[PDB]
Amino acid sequence: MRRIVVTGMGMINSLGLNKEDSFLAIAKGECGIKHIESFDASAFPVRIAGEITDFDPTEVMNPKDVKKAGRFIQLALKATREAMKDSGILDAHNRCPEELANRMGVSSGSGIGGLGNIEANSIFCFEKGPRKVNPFFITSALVNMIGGFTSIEFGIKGPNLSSVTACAAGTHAIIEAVKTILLNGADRMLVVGAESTICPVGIGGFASIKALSTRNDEPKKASRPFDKDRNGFVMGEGAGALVLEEYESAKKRGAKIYAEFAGYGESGDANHITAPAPEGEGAFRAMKMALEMAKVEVGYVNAHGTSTHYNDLYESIALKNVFGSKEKVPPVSSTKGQIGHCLGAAGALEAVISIMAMNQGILPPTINQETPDPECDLDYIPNAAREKQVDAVMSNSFGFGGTNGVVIFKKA
Amino acid sequence: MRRIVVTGMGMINSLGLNKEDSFLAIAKGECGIKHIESFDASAFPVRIAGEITDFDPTEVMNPKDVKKAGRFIQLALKATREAMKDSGILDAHNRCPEELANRMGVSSGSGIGGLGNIEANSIFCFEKGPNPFFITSALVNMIGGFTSIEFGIKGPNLSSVTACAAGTHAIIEAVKTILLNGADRMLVVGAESTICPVGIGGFASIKALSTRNDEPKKASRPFDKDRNGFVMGEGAGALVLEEYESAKKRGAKIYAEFAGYGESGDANHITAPAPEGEGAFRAMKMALEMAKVEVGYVNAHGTSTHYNDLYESIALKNVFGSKEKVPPVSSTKGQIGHCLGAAGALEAVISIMAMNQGILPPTINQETPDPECDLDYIPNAAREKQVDAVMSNSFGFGGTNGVVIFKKA
Ligand SMILES: [Rb+]
Ligand SMILES: [Rb+]
């Protein structure tokens, strides 16, 4: 079986423009949730989000192409430039070498893509007619245009795949790239999950299905996975990126390896379109097959932990069942307190966070742990990071539609 | 390697509500393109589309669920019901047997999902403030959400969103999943319904759509000299894939066997296909090299735009060697329009039934030969010919390419 390793990583989110700054803030328990500025949310029932306030898209595209990409793609370009530079693959012109381009692809994930662009163009058309629809609307909004823009940026011509399984899209983007390399469809794959849906129809839409915290008075206290007073997730934006590479290719070129892919699991609840299944039965199966694939001792779990009542409860039950007992569950934390629930980007962001935690021996905390919930009784690494060396990490993603994805990376 | 066979199929489009009626109409060279009536297009620059005028949503959903499911999911439920019933796997409650449920998943593809639902809620928030639809109704992976609940299938639940290639990538990702032993069976469906103001307006503003509004049935004309853009269609195609031993063990009927696939990216331009169809060439080459069969029929991407049809024809010539070495080719997008993320699933069904029946459906509206598109496109009338393997191309926006090959059982 072909071995697969991680040779480059990057991310951007509401706590940092690169993975070093972002992980530091996350491990220190900071919080990037703020009052919404990107639109006028003053009359909305939810008025907070994990907005990135310091992102300049002209650093990653010329000001003429900025209008051709939705914000989620701009964030993807930032995170993937960071990861591709980190991998050392890029040549003197910051492109994949031409003789290697056909064997490196891209796997991109997003839950909704260019929501704000669809919104704005919907209103243009409604009010002023179809000739007011921007010529660049379609390219800016389609989810796979992450792969379109990034493949052109780096000159990578291998399989160009996209995942759109809602809150699990970023994890499925990793898994689909893994399958592709395992089956010899590529020797390297750029993986990126990216989401930016902080717009009226995005916030309004998740608020009307009652999925969002309405704790508007203290934004930094609103996202509190597994806490007794959790009352909904907080939308965040961001992108995470990883370079996956076949093992011999990485070692022969002397690339520094951050982790080795060890296992994955995929499942569907087939229960409810928005509520997770009682006992986390689908999450249990995805967790179980990843663990049986990897055959390693997981020392840290980055939970899905979106800070909703049912998700955090059912995930906690599934973790206890899959590991066999409360005491056998490794330390767990959700980092969605710090950077919010970034939807399709969550899995890619949290794979990066998990691998950095392993690399640094620092397990980031779940923040806002103020009232213990008797039904969520695991070790959630409350409020302060834990210094602990681990040899493998697990990352969970349990998304709308009952679609579940789990990945395990191990020390290399 | 684990072998994979097709044990059930279904489809709905602008020429039929099931695979038997639509393939017959497609093979006869009929055209489901019509004047747009699903919204007021009277002041639009494009006023034609492959609208399904006779679909009844209430057969596959309850009225409380139309708020929860965009039209593309409704079509997916129709096509997957047909396919799952066809497969014979369903028990007395139209569900997958509980003992097989954990090992059967779903792979769904769509390019844009519930565009019109997002549009409606965008307008409604703008006019009335912080809804007509649930944001759930529009997410592409809710195809897999609804269908997995519908049949009780609990295996990997995956979604593909590579624009015009989504339906073909949905097949391929299911194939990869079965090859790697992540599933023994997978329901595959591509579904698209984006015939709405902002959807027509978005493709019109990028100059991708035919403006031959006076003659709906003559507008979609792949490889013809007077083609001038694609025509939106809506629809859904569905396939049941099963590992070979699993299928024989339960006595499945076998329509075809998976033979090979190829995937590539142009990495050239966000909307313009690459010159010489260079990425399409590579995808086709890898599928042919994997499959090791003689392809007797190609269902082209053939969207009836100037550059797609030209560059696809060049790539075909380069991959097979010369004009006379290319197998018979047809695009069926004249008949049912370009169904975007659904096209690859629809066209896999069309291609497999072509093989089963020995009837190769035509490319229609072949009126003026284009000297640059000089292949055999099976013009206007279906050809009676037995084939042992079929290839289907999907070359989507963003330069993303997918090709799949199926061979005779
Ligand atoms: Rb996670
Ligand atoms: Rb095709």
Side-chain angles (χ1 to χ4, degrees), chain A residues 1-92 94-412, chain B:
Chain A
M1 210 189 46
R2 288 157 59 87
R3 297 171 65 187
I4 299 146
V5 294
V6 182
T7 56
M9 288 198 294
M11 52 181 181
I12 171 159
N13 49 61
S14 54
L15 280 182
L17 301 176
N18 51 67
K19 66 188 190 273
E20 289 78 20
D21 300 345
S22 177
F23 183 75
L24 184 61
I26 290 166
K28 295 174 64 282
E30 289 173 29
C31 184
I33 307 307
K34 309 166 190 83
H35 288 115
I36 294 176
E37 293 203 80
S38 68
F39 70 93
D40 176 11
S42 60
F44 283 57
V46 176
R47 298 188 295 275
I48 58 170
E51 290 184 342
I52 305 156
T53 52
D54 39 2
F55 174 57
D56 176 1
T58 71
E59 313 224 12
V60 295
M61 336 179 55
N62 333 102
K64 295 158 217 244
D65 305 18
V66 169
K67 54 151 172 303
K68 309 182 190 223
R71 184 166 168 99
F72 77 116
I73 296 172
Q74 306 168 8
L75 299 174
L77 275 165
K78 175 71 142 71
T80 58
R81 269 160 67 142
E82 183 189 357
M84 290 288 297
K85 178 191 298 320
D86 187 35
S87 71
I89 281 157
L90 295 184
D91 70 0
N94 291 312
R95 289 172 65 81
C96 177
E98 313 155 29
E99 63 278 16
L100 307 179
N102 292 347
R103 291 289 296 182
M104 184 185 206
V106 55
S107 182
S108 54
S110 178
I112 315 173
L115 202 39
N117 306 79
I118 300 176
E119 211 171 21
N121 274 298
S122 289
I123 294 145
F124 290 158
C125 193
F126 177 64
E127 176 166 18
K128 306 301 218 273
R131 295 201 174 270
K132 294 334 155 73
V133 170
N134 287 319
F136 301 140
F137 164 44
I138 292 298
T139 67
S140 66
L142 297 198
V143 164
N144 72 295
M145 291 298 321
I146 300 171
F149 281 87
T150 57
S151 57
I152 294 163
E153 178 71 20
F154 307 109
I156 56 188
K157 310 188 136 127
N160 190 314
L161 310 176
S162 191
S163 299
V164 64
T165 39
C167 321
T171 293
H172 286 128
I174 298 170
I175 288 167
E176 195 173 11
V178 169
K179 296 173 169 161
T180 303
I181 297 174
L182 282 174
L183 292 172
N184 206 24
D187 301 318
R188 314 141 140 180
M189 292 269 300
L190 180 48
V191 178
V192 47
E195 194 94 60
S196 183
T197 55
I198 303 148
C199 65
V201 56
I203 295 289
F206 282 102
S208 68
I209 67 167
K210 265 54 217 163
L212 300 179
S213 175
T214 51
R215 192 201 290 290
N216 298 301
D217 41 323
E218 296 153 296
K220 291 188 158 190
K221 296 236 189 314
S223 192
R224 50 178 59 230
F226 310 108
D227 188 76
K228 191 166 158 141
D229 303 333
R230 66 194 183 276
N231 66 348
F233 77 85
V234 177
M235 190 181 302
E237 55 167 3
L242 301 102
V243 173
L244 304 177
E245 176 162 17
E246 188 272 324
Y247 173 86
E248 292 294 322
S249 162
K251 302 281 203 178
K252 288 184 181 294
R253 68 184 190 90
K256 171 182 191 159
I257 291 170
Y258 297 82
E260 176 170 1
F261 162 82
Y264 67 73
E266 304 180 306
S267 73
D269 294 346
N271 174 333
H272 192 290
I273 45 151
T274 167
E279 296 281 274
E281 191 277 329
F284 173 86
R285 287 181 278 126
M287 282 221 270
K288 182 163 148 184
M289 309 176 272
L291 292 165
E292 310 183 299
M293 194 164 288
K295 298 222 153 174
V296 297
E297 295 221 29
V298 177
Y300 168 62
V301 176
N302 188 274
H304 191 49
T306 60
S307 191
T308 65
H309 183 261
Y310 271 135
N311 166 81
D312 300 5
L313 172 71
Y314 292 168
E315 185 176 10
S316 292
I317 297 167
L319 280 155
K320 179 214 45 138
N321 291 342
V322 85
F323 281 103
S325 96
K326 179 196 253 172
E327 301 80 13
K328 279 194 224 188
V329 184
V332 184
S333 74
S334 174
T335 48
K336 292 187 177 57
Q338 283 100 320
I339 55 159
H341 178 18
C342 298
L343 298 177
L349 286 162
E350 291 153 11
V352 178
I353 293 169
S354 294
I355 295 166
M356 291 178 81
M358 174 161 66
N359 291 343
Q360 298 185 23
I362 301 163
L363 306 184
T366 313
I367 65 168
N368 292 333
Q369 297 300 295
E370 289 167 2
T371 313
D373 183 341
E375 301 182 286
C376 297
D377 56 10
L378 309 171
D379 172 20
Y380 303 112
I381 315 174
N383 300 323
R386 180 153 332 139
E387 309 171 33
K388 186 73 186 137
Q389 303 291 348
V390 302
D391 298 324
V393 297
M394 198 168 77
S395 182
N396 294 345
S397 301
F398 309 135
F400 293 93
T403 182
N404 304 308
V406 178
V407 290
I408 296 179
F409 290 94
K410 57 181 182 182
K411 182 172 292 343
Chain B
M1 280 311 262
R2 288 165 52 103
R3 295 170 62 185
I4 298 149
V5 292
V6 182
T7 59
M9 294 195 305
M11 65 164 156
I12 171 160
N13 49 58
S14 57
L15 279 177
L17 295 186
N18 54 62
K19 71 197 216 302
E20 278 80 27
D21 306 332
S22 37
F23 181 83
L24 181 64
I26 286 165
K28 286 166 162 302
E30 302 174 23
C31 184
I33 304 308
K34 314 158 178 92
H35 283 112
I36 288 172
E37 307 269 12
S38 62
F39 67 93
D40 175 23
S42 55
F44 272 59
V46 180
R47 309 193 278 299
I48 56 168
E51 284 185 344
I52 305 168
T53 51
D54 52 345
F55 173 61
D56 181 23
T58 75
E59 153 202 338
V60 307
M61 311 185 346
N62 309 140
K64 282 302 286 319
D65 289 39
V66 189
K67 183 150 208 203
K68 311 176 180 204
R71 192 171 165 88
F72 80 115
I73 295 167
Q74 305 168 15
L75 303 171
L77 271 170
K78 172 92 173 127
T80 52
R81 278 198 185 187
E82 178 184 6
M84 296 286 285
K85 188 203 197 237
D86 189 45
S87 78
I89 190 133
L90 295 188
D91 71 4
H93 304 281
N94 294 314
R95 289 167 58 78
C96 178
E98 193 262 32
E99 65 257 32
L100 319 182
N102 281 357
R103 283 295 287 184
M104 171 160 199
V106 50
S107 176
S108 55
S110 177
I112 329 185
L115 188 46
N117 285 23
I118 296 178
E119 179 175 43
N121 283 280
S122 291
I123 292 164
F124 177 101
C125 189
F126 174 68
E127 291 198 294
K128 305 212 158 48
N131 290 15
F133 306 95
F134 286 136
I135 198 185
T136 122
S137 80
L139 302 181
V140 166
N141 76 293
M142 302 294 309
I143 298 172
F146 279 92
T147 55
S148 70
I149 293 152
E150 173 97 3
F151 306 111
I153 53 193
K154 300 199 252 153
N157 195 305
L158 310 175
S159 210
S160 291
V161 68
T162 36
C164 311
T168 292
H169 284 126
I171 293 168
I172 290 164
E173 187 170 20
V175 163
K176 293 186 189 158
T177 305
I178 298 178
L179 287 172
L180 289 170
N181 206 27
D184 300 313
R185 312 161 154 81
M186 295 263 300
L187 173 59
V188 183
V189 51
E192 196 89 62
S193 184
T194 54
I195 301 169
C196 66
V198 78
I200 296 292
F203 283 99
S205 68
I206 220 171
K207 306 307 190 196
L209 296 187
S210 175
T211 56
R212 192 193 289 287
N213 299 308
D214 40 314
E215 313 183 272
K217 299 207 158 353
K218 305 290 189 62
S220 189
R221 48 195 315 130
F223 310 102
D224 182 270
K225 176 86 154 13
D226 302 316
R227 65 194 190 271
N228 60 356
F230 72 89
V231 180
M232 218 167 275
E234 59 172 352
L239 301 303
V240 177
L241 301 186
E242 291 185 60
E243 182 273 333
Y244 179 62
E245 294 308 318
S246 307
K248 303 183 17 166
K249 192 173 85 172
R250 71 171 196 87
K253 74 226 207 63
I254 295 173
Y255 284 101
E257 170 171 6
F258 164 76
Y261 64 80
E263 302 175 306
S264 70
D266 287 2
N268 173 85
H269 180 279
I270 51 193
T271 48
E276 310 305 284
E278 183 277 337
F281 170 81
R282 276 187 285 117
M284 285 195 270
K285 280 294 226 233
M286 295 169 281
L288 296 170
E289 180 91 16
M290 183 180 292
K292 295 167 226 293
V293 300
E294 161 176 28
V295 170
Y297 168 62
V298 176
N299 186 277
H301 194 47
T303 58
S304 185
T305 63
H306 171 74
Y307 291 118
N308 171 86
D309 299 1
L310 180 53
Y311 291 161
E312 182 168 22
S313 297
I314 299 169
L316 279 163
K317 176 174 299 102
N318 285 335
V319 86
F320 289 103
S322 88
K323 176 198 145 53
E324 299 80 2
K325 292 172 191 181
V326 179
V329 180
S330 79
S331 171
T332 45
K333 289 184 178 67
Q335 293 98 312
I336 69 177
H338 185 2
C339 298
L340 301 178
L346 290 165
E347 296 160 359
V349 176
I350 294 168
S351 296
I352 295 170
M353 303 158 69
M355 182 161 58
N356 301 328
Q357 295 195 24
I359 296 178
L360 306 192
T363 313
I364 67 169
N365 295 317
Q366 296 308 286
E367 282 178 337
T368 312
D370 190 326
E372 289 179 323
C373 291
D374 51 0
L375 305 177
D376 169 26
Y377 302 115
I378 313 177
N380 302 315
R383 168 168 327 143
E384 305 178 297
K385 193 183 198 182
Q386 306 294 330
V387 301
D388 297 318
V390 297
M391 182 167 88
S392 181
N393 300 336
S394 298
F395 307 131
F397 286 76
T400 180
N401 304 312
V403 173
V404 60
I405 294 181
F406 291 91
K407 44 195 215 185
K408 193 160 258 160

